[PDB]
Ligand binder design. Structure first.
Ligand SMILES: OC[C@H]1O[C@@H](O)[C@H](O)[C@@H]1O
Ligand SMILES: OC[C@H]1O[C@@H](O)[C@H](O)[C@@H]1O
Lengths: 115, 115
């Protein structure tokens, strides 16, 4: 609209406040309001891609860019002992917002299975 | 060596067998020998990147490519109700092999937290 019609679109357009960590021309990172670890933030693309299953071949760089920004923000937030990155797709994956988002969690030992 | 010096390097060079799903000029996907869901496979880059924290800006496309291949393989393996993609970094993240790898799990309801 630009930014999509989900709550993420409101965050991107600054219609509703968020604890934004970093922002560039392609994405934005902000803290998850329901953290599952001491540090839990999300990196979302400004381009609205509803689900990872709908991403096209041309979205390759953009998707890779979310992971680069994620590792940079994780280092900046002091997650030197490690972290886990997660992308949820659909019902079975637990996707709650239909705008592609990358979860980054750390600050504690992450267990296995990953859910 | 090419392909790295971890077991992944042996798989890439076909020195040890694996249940390979797909392979292109940049990556390879194969089933995880210790599945945590009905469908659990990995997509690994042929270029040896030890950890996601060490990936450079130029590895952006390659990292994005692992996710595109992942969603394509997930659809091909019949994971139409969803899945979860996971990248583990370091001790806290549970990274067991020092070669960047993307986990794709589905075929069951994935829970939250993701570990
Ligand atoms: O799945 C989207 C995520 O965004 C956050 O706003 C929620 O807590 C959820 O974890
Ligand atoms: O972390 C690397 C993964 O590769 C598989 O070989 C192991 O079971 C493990 O889950």
């Amino acid at each position: 609209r630009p930014g999509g019609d989900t709550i993420f679109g409101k965050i991107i357009r600054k219609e509703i406040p968020a604890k934004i960590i970093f922002e560039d021309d392609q994405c934005l990172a902000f803290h998850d309001i329901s953290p599952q670890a001491p540090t839990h933030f999300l990196v979302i693309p400004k381009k609205h891609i509803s689900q990872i299953s709908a991403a096209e071949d041309a979205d390759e760089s953009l998707l890779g860019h979310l992971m680069i920004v994620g590792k940079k923000c994780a280092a900046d937030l002091g997650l030197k002992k490690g972290y886990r990155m997660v992308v949820n797709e659909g019902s079975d994956g637990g996707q709650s917002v239909y705008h592609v988002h990358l979860h980054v969690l750390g600050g504690r030992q992450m267990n296995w299975p990953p859910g």
